[PDB]
Design an enzyme around this catalytic site. Structure first.
Site, PDB file in Angstrom:
ATOM      1  N   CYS A 112      -5.697   8.717 -26.549  1.00  0.00           N
ATOM      2  CA  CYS A 112      -5.518   9.951 -27.298  1.00  0.00           C
ATOM      3  C   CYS A 112      -4.056  10.213 -27.618  1.00  0.00           C
ATOM      4  O   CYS A 112      -3.705  10.609 -28.744  1.00  0.00           O
ATOM      5  CB  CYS A 112      -6.152  11.142 -26.566  1.00  0.00           C
ATOM      6  SG  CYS A 112      -5.528  11.427 -24.881  1.00  0.00           S
ATOM      7  N   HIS A 162      -5.540  15.208 -22.307  1.00  0.00           N
ATOM      8  CA  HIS A 162      -6.068  14.824 -23.587  1.00  0.00           C
ATOM      9  C   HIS A 162      -5.330  15.625 -24.647  1.00  0.00           C
ATOM     10  O   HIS A 162      -4.844  16.727 -24.393  1.00  0.00           O
ATOM     11  CB  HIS A 162      -7.586  15.086 -23.621  1.00  0.00           C
ATOM     12  CG  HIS A 162      -8.311  14.507 -24.809  1.00  0.00           C
ATOM     13  ND1 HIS A 162      -8.739  13.199 -24.825  1.00  0.00           N
ATOM     14  CD2 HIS A 162      -8.629  15.032 -26.009  1.00  0.00           C
ATOM     15  CE1 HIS A 162      -9.299  12.957 -26.012  1.00  0.00           C
ATOM     16  NE2 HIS A 162      -9.269  14.052 -26.739  1.00  0.00           N
ATOM     17  N   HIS A 174      -8.844  13.069 -33.027  1.00  0.00           N
ATOM     18  CA  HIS A 174      -8.412  12.532 -31.754  1.00  0.00           C
ATOM     19  C   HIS A 174      -9.111  11.214 -31.482  1.00  0.00           C
ATOM     20  O   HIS A 174     -10.186  10.986 -32.006  1.00  0.00           O
ATOM     21  CB  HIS A 174      -8.680  13.534 -30.609  1.00  0.00           C
ATOM     22  CG  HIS A 174     -10.115  13.868 -30.352  1.00  0.00           C
ATOM     23  ND1 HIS A 174     -10.562  14.144 -29.081  1.00  0.00           N
ATOM     24  CD2 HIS A 174     -11.144  14.089 -31.202  1.00  0.00           C
ATOM     25  CE1 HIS A 174     -11.836  14.494 -29.183  1.00  0.00           C
ATOM     26  NE2 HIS A 174     -12.230  14.466 -30.443  1.00  0.00           N
TER      27      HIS A 174
END
Length: 220
Positions: A112, A162, A174
């Site tokens: 990510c 994240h 993402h």
């Protein structure tokens, strides 16, 4: 000393080289330390101060630097103009076959935070490598203040684990993993009304950040 990478290099999170930490694109600068352990040597990438372990075989893929990396600076208004290109990078990456690769940074397979770093580098802007560092670095904003090109953070109470790139209308792009995500790059929404993936990440929403400068770490 400082070197330029002649090929894309894998950096690992330990001397054992069993888990990828980041990947250094061709042309990046790194410094090679005297800390050799096992069959690896500790290095530190110059543009993001990110440390990791390089296989000793890969030393032949380095060329000495005579001009040391120095970071470029950008004003807030300059950065705003570059955000569309960062977004476009992610959109194009989504269209190439990809899976979620821990430590993936060069493409096509990203994690990510690696996707974020690669997208911004495509427009000349450096971010730190890990999500928690990207949150520390960016200017914290409220969720309601999100605008296209801002970063969205998710994680535990301790830290972001994240990150995604906000697009507008609650949507963000993402790369996400297998257990709760898409095993690669996709679109989700910051709403409990979204699909199961969107809901899973929404439960973990932590914060939001605006890119207000390009990263300029300390020379060690």
């Amino acid at each position: 000393g400082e070197y330029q990478c002649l090929a894309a290099l894998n950096l690992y999170d330990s001397p054992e080289c069993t888990s990828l930490a980041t990947q250094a694109a061709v042309g990046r600068h790194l410094q090679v330390t005297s800390n050799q352990q096992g069959a690896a040597v500790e290095v530190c990438l110059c543009e993001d101060d990110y440390p990791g372990w390089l296989s000793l075989g890969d030393l032949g893929l380095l060329k000495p630097a005579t001009v040391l990396y120095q970071a470029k600076s950008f004003s807030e208004s300059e950065i705003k103009k570059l955000l569309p290109g960062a977004i476009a990078f992610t959109q194009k990456a989504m269209q190439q076959s990809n899976y979620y690769l821990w430590g993936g940074t060069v493409g096509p397979n990203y994690d990510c935070s690696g996707l974020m770093q690669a997208a911004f580098v495509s427009v000349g802007i450096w971010l730190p490598r890990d999500a928690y560092q990207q949150e520390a670095f960016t200017q914290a904003i409220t969720i309601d203040e999100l605008a296209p090109g801002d970063l969205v953070f998710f994680g535990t109470p301790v830290k972001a684990t994240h990150v995604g790139l906000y697009l507008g209308d609650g949507c963000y792009i993402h790369s996400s993993g297998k257990a709760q995500g898409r095993d690669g790059i996709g679109i989700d929404i910051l709403s409990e009304q979204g699909d199961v993936v969107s809901r899973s990440y929404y439960q973990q929403l932590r914060g939001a950040g605006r890119v207000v400068k390009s990263y300029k770490p300390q020379r060690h």
